[PDB]
């Protein structure tokens, strides 16, 4: 919040510039930084916390340098010990045709999760879309979070 330059190099959004002319503000002041953000398409909506926020993240869909294309998928949040990335589980049934019966299977995906989502928990349901390769094992990025079709965080009044 109050400080974000925790790295050895200065952190800023590309395409935003601050004028060093007409700088007078009197006894008070206003934000020296305007905010860059965009529409993703496909009927998704940009979070309020991306527009009203102050974080820097170049891999963010709403406020960074990525294009959402190809497949849209969903899965269950299962681990989150990395920084700005999480692991999700996908479960399915496989048909074996000699018998007339099914077999249970799973796979894991590592995905990139930006700030603007900040109340996610293990067992939440998440929707993701493809990007260019973002790191060695990461190809997908979080577009929406939900806990519909399941029990509450704490008691039923949540």
């Amino acid at each position: 919040m109050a400080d974000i330059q925790t790295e050895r190099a200065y952190q800023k959004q590309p395409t935003i510039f601050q004028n060093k002319k007409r700088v007078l503000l009197g006894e008070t002041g206003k934000e020296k930084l305007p905010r860059y953000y965009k529409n993703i398409g496909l009927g998704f909506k940009t979070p309020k916390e991306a527009i009203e926020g102050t974080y820097i993240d170049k891999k963010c869909p709403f406020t960074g340098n990525v294009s959402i294309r190809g497949r849209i998928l969903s899965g269950v949040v299962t681990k989150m010990k990395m920084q700005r990335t999480i692991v999700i589980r996908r479960d399915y049934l496989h048909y074996i045709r000699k018998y007339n019966r099914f077999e249970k299977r799973h796979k894991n995906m590592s995905v990139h999760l930006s700030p603007c989502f900040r109340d996610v928990q293990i067992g939440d349901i998440v929707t993701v879309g493809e990007c260019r390769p973002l790191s060695k094992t990461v190809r997908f990025n979080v577009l929406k979070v939900t806990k519909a079709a399941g029990t509450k965080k704490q008691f039923q009044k949540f």
Binding site: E7, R8, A9, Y10, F17, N19, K20, K21, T137
Partner: protein, 206 residues
Amino acid sequence: GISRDNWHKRRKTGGKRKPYHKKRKYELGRPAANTKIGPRRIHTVGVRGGNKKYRALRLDVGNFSWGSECCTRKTRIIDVVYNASNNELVRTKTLVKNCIVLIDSTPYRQWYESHYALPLGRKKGAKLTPEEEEILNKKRSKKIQKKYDERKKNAKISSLLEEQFQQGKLLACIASRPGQCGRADGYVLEGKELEFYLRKIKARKG
């Protein structure tokens, strides 16, 4: 020789993989430019598709922008003072993208003093009056002093730059890739970027 392939290294599970084929030519890599400060030395290489690429080994001069004033000019490069990635690059004086450098203030000072009709880099009267006062004051029929309110009411520079101009050097940041373009070229440090790197420079050695 050198190569940039994905298949020489292990998978998500920690398991090995065996080679699928010999090294291909499209997987190639080459040694680094390691560009120094010094009089121009550039070499050229042929690249995939028959195109050409330029590699700078020595550079003495660059193009820099003072974005606050919409002024850009060809300028001498003096020294390197900070590098976010590795300290051996400033100890050996190597020039790369987002490196922090010192540049000659003169062509910006000459543009400002002739545009605003005011002094900038001056200490005392002995470096104002004896020559070049005729840049500042001349006959100007119905353009003499009050019509320069279009200039004078917006002339004041930031205190952090007025302290740099008196020493004859400005801090700047490299924006081009010199080992790929053959050019060293960028912008003058200002505002909170200038406060950030002045704190980092002082906290390292001072």
